[PDB]
Design a protein around this ligand. Structure first.
Ligand SMILES: CCCC(=O)CC(=O)N[C@H]1CCOC1=O
Ligand SMILES: CCCC(=O)CC(=O)N[C@H]1CCOC1=O
Lengths: 164, 161
């Protein structure tokens, strides 16, 4: 269920420390399990009103990047054909995200053996587009590993907390 | 929905795809092993391991008792075969038999997909120098993980129904 505010604070802490090495960016680490679909865990520096609105309306159920990630193992851009396709069918999430300047970005995806899907979603925000996309592309293997090691760390911390 | 990964022409093309890329990290032994976690009896194996070892491993379903496969099942991050999680599993029959093929030192990279598959990329220096090998894997582990991801992504697209 991943409700432990204290572990999630160390995870957010672990991500922010390492993710700033690829630039000053917005990120969201979002973890969902099929057994608790309306309570995804979100660990992010996105604007809080957007996060709250996203949680309150269960927007992960209609979010083109999350719907695409279900079918992926490899990272993808939000202007990839698969996301554009889903956007044409339901555009609500991107239309509302535009207010908070969440427009262009990338999603990294991970499935585990506990029925979780984990995503690391990254956006520049309002900043200039080209240098961001080119930094993400040159560093995509490293960012994938950060998602992998964040998720391992998270599962590890929840494992120790449950033992004690 | 995904089909069984059993077209010989496709698997040989994917073998060439892996082999050309993984040789950037040294002269090494590799096995790409994909296993369905619901029905795990008959995994797909694309490998340059010694053919007699591969044949023996398939005939005896050794993945079911292989410490690195049993470890990968509960992992998302790569691990060395001397890591504490693997030594715990070490039934040691698989490693004892593998030693006769110089397959002693190695790493496993793992990937769970959304079709109940677990894909692993297992790599070993065989009889070549273990120090150079370990250093090359340690500094290239992010690229090797991405090689597994892109290989599996290709397989998923090729076998999609
Ligand atoms: C609030 C966290 C939302 C996510 O973690 C997924 C995500 O980043 N979706 C993007 C797509 C466009 O607007 C978003 O928020
Ligand atoms: C024949 C392919 C076997 C594998 O793909 C898994 C693997 O590499 N297991 C290692 C562990 C020690 O001996 C092995 O063969």
């Amino acid at each position: 269920y991943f409700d432990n505010e204290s572990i999630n604070e160390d995870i957010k802490n672990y991500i922010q420390r390492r993710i700033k090495a690829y630039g000053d960016l917005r990120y969201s680490y979002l973890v969902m399990n099929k057994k608790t679909p309306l309570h995804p865990t979100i660990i992010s520096n996105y604007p809080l009103d957007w996060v709250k609105k996203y949680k309150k309306n269960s927007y992960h159920l209609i979010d083109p990047v999350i719907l695409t990630a279900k079918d992926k193992v490899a990272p993808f851009a939000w202007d990839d054909n698969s996301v554009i396709n889903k956007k044409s069918t339901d555009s609500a999430v991107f239309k509302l995200a535009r207010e908070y300047n969440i427009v262009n970005g990338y999603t990294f995806v991970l499935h585990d053996n506990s029925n979780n899907m984990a995503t690391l979603n990254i956006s520049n925000g309002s900043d200039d587009s080209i240098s961001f996309d080119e930094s993400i592309e040159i560093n995509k293997e490293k960012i994938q590993m950060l998602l992998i090691l964040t998720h391992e760390k998270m599962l590890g911390l929840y494992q120790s907390n449950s033992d004690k």
